[PDB]
Amino acid sequence: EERVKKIIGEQLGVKQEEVTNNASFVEDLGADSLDTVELVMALEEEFDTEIPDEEAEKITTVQAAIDYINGH
């Protein structure tokens, strides 16, 4: 249920073929910090959650976000 590959896909404007689990948002997915804040917000919108900055700041990779959603 990693429909995250859609969210990220639409969020950073990159084809789903690019969403490697081991890809970082800034290095690999070519996004700035503003883009990433909007990203965590959008994910909160999809999965209807709330990520405090403590654990939200960690979200820097696809596997990190998917793993966080699976837990929590």
């Binding site: 910090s33 503003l34 804040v37 909007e38 917000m41 900055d53």
Partner: peptide, 14 residues
């Protein structure tokens, strides 16, 4: 600055 961006966007969405 970043936290401020977060706050303003999240509040505007309401």
């Amino acid at each position: 600055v970043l936290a401020l961006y977060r706050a303003m966007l999240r509040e505007s969405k309401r």
